[PDB]
Amino acid sequence: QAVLTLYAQGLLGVVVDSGDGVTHICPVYEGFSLPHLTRRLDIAGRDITRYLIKLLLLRGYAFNHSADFETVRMIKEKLCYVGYNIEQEQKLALETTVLVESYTLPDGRIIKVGGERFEAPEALFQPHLINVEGVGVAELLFNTIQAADIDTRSEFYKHIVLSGGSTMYPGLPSRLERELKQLYLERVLKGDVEKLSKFKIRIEDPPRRKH
Amino acid sequence: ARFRKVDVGEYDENKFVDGPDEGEVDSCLRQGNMTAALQAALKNPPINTKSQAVKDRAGSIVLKVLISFKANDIEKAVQSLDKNGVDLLMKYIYKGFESPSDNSSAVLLQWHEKALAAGGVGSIVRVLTARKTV
Amino acid sequence: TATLRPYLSAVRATLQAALCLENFSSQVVERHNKPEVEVRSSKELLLQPVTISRNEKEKVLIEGSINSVRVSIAVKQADEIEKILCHKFMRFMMMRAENFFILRRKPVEGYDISFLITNFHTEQMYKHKLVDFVIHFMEEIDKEISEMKLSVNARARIVAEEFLKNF
Amino acid sequence: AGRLPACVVDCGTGYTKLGYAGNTEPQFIIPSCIAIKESVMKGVDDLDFFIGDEAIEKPTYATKWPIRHGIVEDWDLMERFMEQVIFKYLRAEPEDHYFLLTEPPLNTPENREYTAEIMFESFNVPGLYIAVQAVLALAASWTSRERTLTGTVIDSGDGVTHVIPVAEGYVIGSCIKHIPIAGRDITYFIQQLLRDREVGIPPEQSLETAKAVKERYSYVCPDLVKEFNKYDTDGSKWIKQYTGINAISKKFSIDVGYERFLGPEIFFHPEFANPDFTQPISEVVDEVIQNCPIDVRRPLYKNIVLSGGSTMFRDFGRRLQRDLKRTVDARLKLSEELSKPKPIDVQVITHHMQRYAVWFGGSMLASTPEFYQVCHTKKDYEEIGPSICRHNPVFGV
Amino acid sequence: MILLEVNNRIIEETLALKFENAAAGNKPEAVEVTFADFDGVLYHISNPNGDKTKVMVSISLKFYKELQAHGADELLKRVYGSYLVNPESGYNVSLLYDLENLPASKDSIVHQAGMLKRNCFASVFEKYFQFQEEGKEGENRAVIHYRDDETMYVESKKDRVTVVFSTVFKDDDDVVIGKVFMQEFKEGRRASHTAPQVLFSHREPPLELKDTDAAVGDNIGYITFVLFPRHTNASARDNTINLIHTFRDYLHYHIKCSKAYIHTRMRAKTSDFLKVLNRARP
Amino acid sequence: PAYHSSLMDPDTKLIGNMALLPIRSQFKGPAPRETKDTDIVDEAIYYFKANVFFKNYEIKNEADRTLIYITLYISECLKKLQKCNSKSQGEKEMYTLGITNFPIPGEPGFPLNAIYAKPANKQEDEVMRAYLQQLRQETGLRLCEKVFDPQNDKPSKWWTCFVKRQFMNKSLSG
Amino acid sequence: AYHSFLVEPISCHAWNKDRTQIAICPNNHEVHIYEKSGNKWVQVHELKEHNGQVTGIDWAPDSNRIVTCGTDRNAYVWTLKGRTWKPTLVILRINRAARCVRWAPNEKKFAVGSGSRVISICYFEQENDWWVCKHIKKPIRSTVLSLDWHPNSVLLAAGSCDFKCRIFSAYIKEVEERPAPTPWGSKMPFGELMFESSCGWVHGVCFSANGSRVAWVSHDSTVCLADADKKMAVATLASETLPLLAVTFITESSLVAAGHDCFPVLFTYDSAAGKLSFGGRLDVPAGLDSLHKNSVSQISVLSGGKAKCSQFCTTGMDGGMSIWDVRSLESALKDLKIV
């Protein structure tokens, strides 16, 4: 699939794909994929839906990981999104109410959801928040490339493409870029914040996606 | 796992990037010529200087003319200014509000009342919209 | 009150100028929509902060932006009893900030209470009525604090008398 | 561990149980009502009220009931009600005792914040824990058993009966079901049964007698016809007598019969007294456990715990278990035939602390050292806010 | 309720239910109860050695030794006489009621049992009132630490007996409300010229104790009552004792009910603000 | 649930969709002759007190329709037997009552017309009217030896109290 | 003449050629088309495709095609097939919300302003049979708020949050040819910056009927006009009221605008003195004395073109759409001017 996804966008780059079961970073060079350099992020859709439950049981709501799984999943798909700057998001959640939304449940009783909206998807960037050793797609992608050939780096970085159900969270492309930049700056240019600016990353979120 | 500590956006090339004669005022103030002092303090505002020092100065002079006014003598003075003057006055009145003092604020609320009737709410808007201000 | 009406009038006027908001999609984050005056991630979108003061204690800070306004108020507090009644009363409303959708959960540092009015609010509420609520709010909390003060004293006296008259 | 025991207060829609942790029975069991003056409060008029029994007949006072359907509908009145619970009955200096309060399942986080506001901002309690009734009830049954916090709770107070499934200390909210049958309905029924037969019963003392008869001679029978038969054959050793005093004239006797077993019978045959509800309680329980996760149904069936004064009738559980096993075994009979599912073990637990199961659980938990590590302290309240009381970690197993 | 009641309801109700059952002829049920009272007082009602025919009521006061050095045991004995027995381990005073040997009027002893706590304090006051009434001056002052960080000082003089209280206001804002009430006590004479004069010091003790290790601090508060012969005499004594030993709790209780009341004002006000806000909607 | 009859036989005859159940009576009618110690009229009386409280009754076989009819009629007997002063007088009212023509299936005034099959012809019609009259008679005289206590003029209150309750909220007098 | 389509905002609107139908976005992901039947409005079409809030609508009069853009970053050209509107995706190549869209007069292209701080000039290619677009980037530094084509379908005026009002050249030589010179300039290669004004986000921009005059309103409560015939000199006028959000020409020297005051106003340009002047309210009689009960966010000329306009439409955040008559206004206000 990673091959085809690059096909549709009319290219022959890297493909970040995540569904319910798992996440895959498949870099593709002028033709096909290369197992070496191709990794897997062991956290996807489900794991976020599970976290959204621990977060809501923490709020004071009687959810059951099995009886209500499908219900919380729909809450995730409708309300969750990826924080850009977690420090700025926690402030919005702590100091104001602009994140609080109401969600009517199947039987009709209402519940309010706020900070949880971004905290759950955050698992993708801090696996430790749900007990999973890894460094999160952000850091992972950056190692699947930086570690690769030096003759494709620049090409790859300006050719990343999202794919799958767990990649439509609002703001994901933006967070990915901020992370990659942050990694580049320190881990590859020793914090020399001037040679930057000319670092080129273009993580595209295509609309045609469905098919 | 440090690296999220650096605010990368601060180096994003797509971002955005943007007094009067103290003696002349004193001269009219000592002579009791109030309307004149006002019109002099509202001249050549430090609209382009970087130091808050030169600006705080211009503000002081202007503020020293407003406080030095008699309640029933403000309406007249306001109406002697042109729209640009009214807009500039309004910017200073709002500056004065940041330095309350022995009734300094009680009279400034008089200048505001008068200035607004002349410049309309529009002048206040131009206080909120100014990128280069006093 | 010789300084009250003039104060509320300058506040009402500034509030009318700040509540000219419109919906604004994020320029910094894909498919996000945020109250700019809060995240402040795009300087051109912010307006010049202004303050209207009645005296050295009472004032109002008004911070605008293309899509939202933050209004902070410094409440009149004469003596110790008023200071604590005001503080309990502000926390009381803040804990209920969700029902009171224009209130911040915490004040801007240096003030007793803060509002955060967004374009979404001005789209479902007449802005001239919100401006009226902020003025109505300032007048009314002063009265409520005065009444609380009188109530405590009233009950204090009866409590000190009920005990003493029994000896 | 401390020199003083914690205060345990269980507020119900009808009655409030209060006392100190470590004891077995509550120290006071009073009507969840408060009487005030009504006909702009000033001075100390707010303190002019009474609660519990003292509040039911007060001449110049109006009786209010702060809690409806288990949820606080008047915080002003609830806050005062606590004032006397603490200062008049318990006589506890609130700053010295940790408090354990209860709440029905499905209570909102907002309400917990309101409760905490009252306990920390008003009475300045050093620590507060809010437990869910259902879970405490489960814990209460341990007094007669491997102990688990998984099971189905049948709470029948006086307003309504609830079938609450619980898994590992956590209520499966989406699966609760309520039943329009409880102590009150039983009384009313026994009232109709008397009106149609007994005479000389003071019209203004209709309830007094029925409630008395119910509480003194009622019970659950195994079979309706066989029971009716017993009463018509050996009438002398089944028909009981009741004698009351006419409040007007101080002068009456009535035979008590069929109603002894017919009243409680309505739990099993709701169509008897209720035109809108006809599901037998055995069926409601079955439905609930079936709606839950397949992998927790057997544990639920294996631990059905009773709770409330209305599950106190002699043989209540025996009849619930028998009927429940019939509906369940029948379903498994159809399966085999259609096609060997291992039989399902159905237990309906009954114990000595049932009537105030919830309070006893609360009391036993507040006596353990673990309860002090799990309470939200004042310090945490002040440094994190009321939002800390939104989640009370379940403990005890 | 404005004045805190003096008797203990759990003691009274528990006894009555056992006394009524004993009179009826029923077989005695066992009893095991642990409860408290204001000022860290701990109680215990139980059947000594499992004997369901006997009911013991025991009280524990961290500061008993101090009241003991002031006529405590003696006053107690005069009051309970044959009901007082050797104190249960963990407690200071124990009352033993024999269900098989109850007085004709069981109501009279049930009332005294409920006052166990009040009677333990009684002496320290009865003693110093006795001093005043006899002229004996110079007598050292009594120092009762009724709480871990709170103290009461009783001292007699030529024409008056004084009771001082060192009380702590854990909550910082509680001090402010406290003053409002204290000021109204300071002016109580403007309503009852005969009643006790009341003084009040915030942060520091009254000079007489500035040499002693008395406490000082932002949350401490001293209150001085000045009882006169018309209160201390043997005709008012009890009632005076009943009021004065509940004062500390009387004060803190009203400070709390005061906040409860402010809360209802806030609920009403907030509720109104929400109604206006919602009328701004089309 | 409700109490049903256990008399339906793979050889039991039907009149309409009711069951022509045997009975041990002398009265005339097409009711077979019962050999056994219990017939559908005892069963119905044995159960009445309990069944009468039910609001819903599931018809499992055709005998239930017979049980049901007898049950609804017992309530009828109690309507009368309620106001009488003797175990002899009551015997008479029960006779008259039983001979009086009550509504049958198909006619307006017979509850449950949606459950009881209507007589397909004049014979089936006269036969059924007969079977019901015979059931009504045995049922009445049999009910007097129960309702009355060895102390004459005593329509036991333990039979009169049900006079106001209606099985399935239906009536033969309506 | 006021009408209320809903109680929430009408994000944006667009009328067809004959002013027989109006397409509005009700603070929704959808576009609603209403047609009049007698003296009632009736919903006739529901365009559901955008996954985000629609922010701009434009109806191409002759080809009868509707173009929409939304916060979901997409643009959709809508074609009428019998009795249904079918949407065709257009990749704008942006990563922030689109904010505005306008067909060129020749209906050969259309521009989309967005948060990406760029303008997407889109045109169809009968070659590969799909929509493509070039970008105009420099010197735009912020979100593009408004747009307006020049009658020559080449020059494009734009206003954005970087406080500037600019005129560019959307010259695409593969759908049109060498634009004839204009007072704005001679050299018009793609993306050339023809003009740039010299405080306040620019909510609206408008080109006069002949194109030698461009006007725009900003957040600092001012209205401006740059005369191409007078070396692009700029006339400025400070209002004493709240910020205007929309503006159009009604004659070569008359402008109508509206905004946060909730009522339209008239402005006039004295060519000789190079000075703008206040012509006064046009809406002369909740607790408001204006027809709209909330901010007016868009205004369009219904008939008479920008040369001799007779009727114009307004829509606002109150959910209402007003149709104003110029002769009726000239009558009710004996003191009204116009040019």
Ligand SMILES: Cc1[nH]c2ccccc2c1CCNC(=O)c1cccs1
């Ligand atoms: C109560 C309830 N109904 C549901 C329907 C579908 C999925 C979950 C649920 C739940 C459990 C979570 N809800 C709550 O805890 C509360 C809802 C409203 C007030 S509390």
